[PDB]
């Protein structure tokens, strides 16, 4: 037992690699992919956000399609309290950011659960009548124009795809509707995405996770509706349905990033085709370097039990060896009895993948499909990334202020973390789509010779790796810095001891 | 579209994954092999021939529960569902039985004939007083050299590492614990040490019973419980004797030790089970994922079955579709390599088990399409080495031109199922269609990714020469008739030079008439 | 055979492990051609010839009569079946018509053809076209066979005589006259060759010598045509035109010797059965610093489409003065079978040197090593990678047979062929064990060796009447070849390819079996 | 340009089936020209055209000849070298190389497959540390003892003198690794090797040295009738441009000329040729198998001049930069950048005029002197030897203004500390 699997990256063979995975290998540390996590009842209090945040929370994703504005402002104000009760050390404080799941076009039902038959026949009235009086043969639905865009044959999932329209069980209320094979008349912005969306950047959200994106107008007009003052707010494209796996070309370039939004997705595909779509988004995302989050029912078993079931480990396992920046819960933390514990899983989970990725193989496919450039800075990126490799570095301290020349450094997948430092407390949250980048937040104030104040933040990062184990006084790591202020000059790549 | 077969012609892994298309349709030919544990849900002859027709190839017998009688007319019902299909050897499809033995389990007592509490007290006895009277506040489990394993503050779990807890406190004949994780407690529940050496026997006195009953009832292979050593995997191969010497072997490998010793298991087993729930209890869970990876690909080195089991679609218990994780378990296990796949309480309990059958199907076969085999065939060969075995030569070299005609399929003719295994060591994209007589040879077949075996019950004809093309043309009918390929299609065909096992070394490149 | 090498995971390595203590195999895969001449005229020294290594006779008729050719293949024939008493042994000689072509040949020096005069650099010469000097040019006129040399070259061009060593810079130009200034000067003999690098000649590709020419090789029952100065594809089908029906098999070899045949390439190798890298006016009709470029850009790409590529000129030139090549000229030979070449050849070092047989010699003692030395790990994956999914049962079957002989290391690949494609299928996938390919087609089994690996046998027993029986015949001929010739030993694992009837195109079986 | 198409092919087959004659190469010639000095070449005049024509080392064949016959040939070398010193951007630095005679038993040559550094060896050898050469041809190696002879017979006053040894007979093949390992290099005198072994086995010798050194990072030279027939001809055959183009596509940093540029009657041509075929020969290398094979093979390293110089040449192949500026006092920097072959040319500036001359054994590495004063502010007189390169260059049509550059510097002054990577554009 080596560490860090460093036996089985080695090897010159996919194969040999995989047969080289040692258990009594461990990962020296720093987990390097980003976990989001639903907040919800489960979740909501403060000192449950703290432990969330200690056990590996890096994202707090809020789901708009429930809850009011004043109940979301609250859940804001309690991750903003437990995020800042770690402040007064600003080299162990980890960044958290706040993420807007818009509710989109969604389809929902009446109220009254009934006892649906197989065979059987209920008549689907869009007829604001019946919108309360709900029963075994009289169902509601709120999608204007849903005569025209269904066709004869087609089928219709109710309650996630439980009950087919054919295969049906019991019937709820209010539950979600899904009409595979598109014709969804919906706006991309419904009235309410609008006013949520202003609720987001009056808030100062970090990112919004656009739900139904099928084209890529449909991110247009999401960033259309942010506006100036939200034109830094990341747009994640959640691909849902057939229409965004096949124009995925067009929004993987109109978004900041993707979320295989695979709940959604494995009613609207055939469920046997998820895990395509899922490695095919990843790969052209870590292509395109782009953030990519896998989401949804990653430890679904452990919204009720204290241990995840052995598909949904080797499911966290298998989305970072794809290539994920993210991973997600959902219900596990928002509304489960060890939304703890599902963090934690997704946190060792992670450590141990992260150090099982074929790096000998990704970081040479990620240099043989990326474009020459004439941009420094990517040049400066792919060259500290092998320096990196060449050193063993215990890190990549990067010098950003709106995260840009991190990410282009996370790109190329480095095994060392990313230490970003950064000013902007928007970019230290932002960073964390990224996978590798560790953001640290800076409050010391600009020194007056600029040579000094990068050589403060250097130092900064330096303490950082130092206090949680990163690297060691007399370790190599790699700098990365530019020749004045002002983003978009990094061109400078060291290679300095720690002190 | 079609197939994967842009992503299949992709200069690097990551373009290849760039190229997975949903909208491309699979094969038609499911190569991974379905394993299915077969219960109350599932035992009736009207419920195992759906089973069947969905998909099921081994049926599995967990021999933890239930009596001799039970299992026996499990089995025969599994032979009245397969036999029930036995009129046209042409749409025939060979079902193994396979026996999943008890091996060294750690049970409890009985609660009364409870519910116990997050960081409570229980007292775990081994008075047998307490055997049939377990309560909230007394635990009895039947190892009883269990205080000379376990040491201070051990963690011990309870109902399939669901409860946990943690010993306060030993003695000699008892042990008082704390409880770590509470919930539900129940009767004859298993215990598993992590982190500690039982010393039960490998082959129990039970086990004896099993095996022996295996035998006589005619069993295709024994998934052996909790191997730690090539000594065990002996043991069982002693055990079976000469009755049984054409019993394969499958090592089960569930716990730390087997794992370290995995190498010396393979080299004596026929074949290596993946079994990931006792593994995900034994071992820290995170790294389950780290285990099966590794098993899979030294047993595709190797040549030898591997076998993906326990938990790929535990949610179809209770519902009739699987979660999203399930279905990306199922995907992933088939993308590693593995040789099969199995379903445990999904069809012997479950309320769904055809449903958990076809899905499973269905997800296999879209995984097997977008397998990069550009990487996986070139490295399969790179690392086996140079042999003077006709038959490797041929097998491989056979899958080399099945690649090159993009052929419908591999037709190998077979006694005892070595050139077809040997054929699909190599993973060919192709299905391996196996002719042989052997019945036992046909249902242990589906062991190994992609071996299509059909039973030829053709008379031996009188001519050598006739009787070899007269099943080589059932092959040609077989392919036909289940959609295989169409005639004027290209098959290879892997026959011999002389009647009786290991003279394998022909290779035709043939049309389909 | 340089098998440490071969099992490196990196080209570099491999270069490092090249151990110049591991000895090659028996078997010399590169074809050997040899220019037949003076010096290799005879039926004594064309023995000593077939027994040092060649395999194809080649025939240069940019000089000499049709009689003296047709003696010249004659004593080739008689050397040849002077081996045909033991067809275990025999070993088949090809013999093939190198064209003269849209040559351009200076007059003679003052009505001699052994006289020369010295250009001294940097004085004049005029250079004429009117016949009246064709019999007296000196150091002051000199007289050219190419009417329009005045209608093609400009003022400031560059003119070559003999072999490109002497340079002319066309200062003043004439209606039939041109005025020069010698660059590089040297002794000027009579006749000598002529290249205009960067002007359109416009000679025909298949003049009326050459007409007359390919219909003697068509009567004399040539083997293969070497075309010289193949500018395009329309080339190679006036050349496919004149051998007409009765010249049908006869394999046409396109000879890339200038810039256009360069730049057409890719047309004219799919019009042509063969490629020649005449690196002699290729080295002067383009710079002399590009010529490795163009040959290892042409061998690749016969390499991709399956067709013989040949490596040709001054390979072993020192050799023709010299019993022992430079060190250069060692190198060229063994980075030209390195390159892929399917042949190498030698013009003057057997057409008129002193030490022709040791040329051979040296030719086949290179070839031998660096044919070890290839990264056929590499070779054999690209080679895969490049060639297209196939409907074709024999193309299924040779790959299949080249990836089990890799699998076992099998001593050769027996391959029963009439026409020879089974043989040449195999062979384009480069495996290491040679391919003995049995035939009773005296042509096939002469063609053959023009592709690199081929070991061709011309079985000399009769049709069995059963014709199983008279495949085991076939196939055990190659065993006996090969225990012979030390190819392999009984208990040998070797590859054997048969076909399902009679008759060529039906080549699907391939067995392993072990050396009776 | 350059063969930028076959460069991006994704196989070894179609890389060679992408090469194109009409695809012009860069103005950089990477391979080192070492000729050899004689009577047809001792002249001042021609040596001047000689280095007009690209030679960069001259050597000293010392199996003949006197000492004060060879003073003054290496004053003429230094006299037509000096003459372009008025002009430090142009300025070529031109390196002496002194070849020993070693065992050599003659009045014809005589081989048959005795002492290391004999008498006469260790005279010649103390006259080229009273000459100040650059480097010396150790003829003759056969083991790490004769290495370690030789360089304790240079001493501490030639310690900087580079040994480079010959390998001459199938000894020094055998023992080619503990050779390699006491060596600064290694040339292949395939003269005497081709007596030594059969001559059909040079080409294995020849690659396996050439490999081993660009895997160990130590100059390899390929040595000996690469033109021969220039010797008394205008014109190459043709398996003696292949045999050039062959040395420059295995990897050999350094090709050589003898008797082409000694005693033979066309050396400006010889010289000439040598530099045209380079260059073709350095636009086919297929860099992107090159790069990757140099660095799988290549241990990680703690040393942050060696992490620093390969994420330099991936990052020059990143943004196709015109060049790798490498400050460097010593040339170790600028040789660890080649040891990666990098596609650009590396413009190592030096102040230290041998480190100037002794670069050419290096591929790829472009010495240049710089004259000006050191400045008071380090960082000024750093950015004063970059600005240096600029205009170099510029003005040897290396770049142009607007191209993007890598440079190579460190964190203070000293030996030993490049381990900062500068992306940047040509002013
Ligand atoms: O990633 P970005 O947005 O390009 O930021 C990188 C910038 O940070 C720096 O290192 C220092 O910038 P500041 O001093 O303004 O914070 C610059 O050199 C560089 O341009
Ligand atoms: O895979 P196995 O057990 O070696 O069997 C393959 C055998 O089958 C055959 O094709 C047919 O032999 P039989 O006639 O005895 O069935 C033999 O040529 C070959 O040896
Ligand atoms: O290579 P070709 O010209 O297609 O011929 C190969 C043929 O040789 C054979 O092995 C024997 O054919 P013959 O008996 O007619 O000589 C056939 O089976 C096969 O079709
Ligand atoms: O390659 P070398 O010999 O180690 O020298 C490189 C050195 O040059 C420098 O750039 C400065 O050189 P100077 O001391 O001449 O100013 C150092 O930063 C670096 O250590
Ligand atoms: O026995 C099993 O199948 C297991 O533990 O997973
Ligand atoms: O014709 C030839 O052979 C040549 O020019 O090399
Ligand atoms: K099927």
Not at 74 to 96: G, Q
Not at 234 to 254: C, M, P, Q, T, Y
Not at 488 to 496: A, D, E, K, L, S
Request: hydrophobic share 40%; net charge neutral.
């Amino acid at each position: 037992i080596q560490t860090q699997q460093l036996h089985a990256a080695m090897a010159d063979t996919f194969l040999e690699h995989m047969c080289r995975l040692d258990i009594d290998s461990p990962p020296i540390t720093a987990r390097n992919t980003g976990i989001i996590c639903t907040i919800g009842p489960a979740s909501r209090s403060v000192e449950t956000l703290k432990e969330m945040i200690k056990s590996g929370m890096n994202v707090a994703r809020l789901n708009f399609s429930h809850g009011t504005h004043e109940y979301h402002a609250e859940t804001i104000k309690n991750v903003r309290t437990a995020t800042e009760s770690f402040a007064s050390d600003p080299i162990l404080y980890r960044p958290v950011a706040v993420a807007l799941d818009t509710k989109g076009p969604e389809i929902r039902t009446g109220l009254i659960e009934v006892e649906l038959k197989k065979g059987a026949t209920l008549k689907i009235t869009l007829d604001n009548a019946y919108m309360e009086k709900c029963d075994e043969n009289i169902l509601w639905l709120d999608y204007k124009n849903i005569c025209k865009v269904v066709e004869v044959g087609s089928k219709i999932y109710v309650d996630d795809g439980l009950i087919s329209l054919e295969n049906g069980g019991s019937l709820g209320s209010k539950k979600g509707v899904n009409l595979p094979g598109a014709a969804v008349d919906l706006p991309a912005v419904s009235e309410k995405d609008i006013q949520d969306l202003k609720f987001g950047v009056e808030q100062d959200v970090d990112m919004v996770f656009a739900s139904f994106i099928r084209k890529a107008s449909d991110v247009h007009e999401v960033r259309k509706v942010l506006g100036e003052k939200g034109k830094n707010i990341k747009i994640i494209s959640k691909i849902e349905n057939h229409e965004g796996v096949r124009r995925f070309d067009e929004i993987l370039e109109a978004s900041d990033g993707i979320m295989v939004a695979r709940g959604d997705l494995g009613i609207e595909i055939p469920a046997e085709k998820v895990f395509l779509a899922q490695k095919m988004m990843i790969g052209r995302c870590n292509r395109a370097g782009k953030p990519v989050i896998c989401a949804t029912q990653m430890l679904e078993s452990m919204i009720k039990k204290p241990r995840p079931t052995r598909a949904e480990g080797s499911d966290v396992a298998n989305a970072v060896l794809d290539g994920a920046d993210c991973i997600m819960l959902s219900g596990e933390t928002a509304k489960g009895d060890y939304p703890l514990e599902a963090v934690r899983m997704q946190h060792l989970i992670a450590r141990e993948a992260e150090a099982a990725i074929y790096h000998l193989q990704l970081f040479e496919e990620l240099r043989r499909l990326a474009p020459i450039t004439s941009d420094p800075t990517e040049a400066t990126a792919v060259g500290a990334v092998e320096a990196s490799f060449k050193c063993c570095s215990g890190a990549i301290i990067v010098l950003t202020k709106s995260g840009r020349s991190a990410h282009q450094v996370a790109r190329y997948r480095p095994r060392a973390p990313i230490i970003a430092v950064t000013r902007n407390p928007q970019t230290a949250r932002q960073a964390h789509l990224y996978r590798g980048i560790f953001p640290v937040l800076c409050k010391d104030p600009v020194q007056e010779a600029w040579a000094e104040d990068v050589d403060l933040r250097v130092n900064f990062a330096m303490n950082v790796g130092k206090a949680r184990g990163f690297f060691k006084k007399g370790d190599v790591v790699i700098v990365l810095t530019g020749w004045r202020p002002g983003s978009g000059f990094t061109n400078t790549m060291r290679v300095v001891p720690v002190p």
